[PDB]
Design a protein around this nucleic acid. Sequence first.
RNA 1: UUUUA
Length: 213
Amino acid sequence: MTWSGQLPPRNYKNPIYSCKVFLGGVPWDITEAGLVNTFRVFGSLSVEWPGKDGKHPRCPPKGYVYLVFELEKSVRSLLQACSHDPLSPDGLSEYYFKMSSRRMRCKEVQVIPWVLADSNFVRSPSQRLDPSRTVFVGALHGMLNAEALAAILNDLFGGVVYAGIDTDKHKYPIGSGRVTFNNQRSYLKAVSAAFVEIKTTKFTKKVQIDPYL
RNA sequence: UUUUA
């Protein structure tokens, strides 16, 4: 029970990016200080790091970092300084650069923006939400289209009334995945049995359920 | 060495 490339035909290219972006790679034991100097501008620049939720259950030499800043002009200045795939902002775009040239210089850091659009949506009719029928989901790329998560949670076992990514860590969008239903059977059976290998011929990932308590 | 409730 798996499928790929069956995502909605809807696309857009007219809007611009938001104040938040991700910065993957950085396996060189650096901290958020690496991005506070990489994106130093005369305007605002604020760091963003989840701090391992203060639990610090692990401490690998690798990790991933983030930032948020009001320079929409610098967001496009660094997305044109970085390069990999200048494709559509519908999650099809991607960029890369590097932070070393004398040690482990065989890699590049991943650079991915976010758009001015809302992070959650569903194609089904709307219904009221409750914490008793929702979940937070991970094991995914930290970023996916809400209309794609709507189709995956609407096709693999039954229908759904809300899906996508939810906003956190700051006043700007995106942070972690979420989905909500109106029946407990379609609820945990779809989001926990979505072991499928999700693909759109330019991205590959999986999804897993996690309770809020 | 690929993403924050």
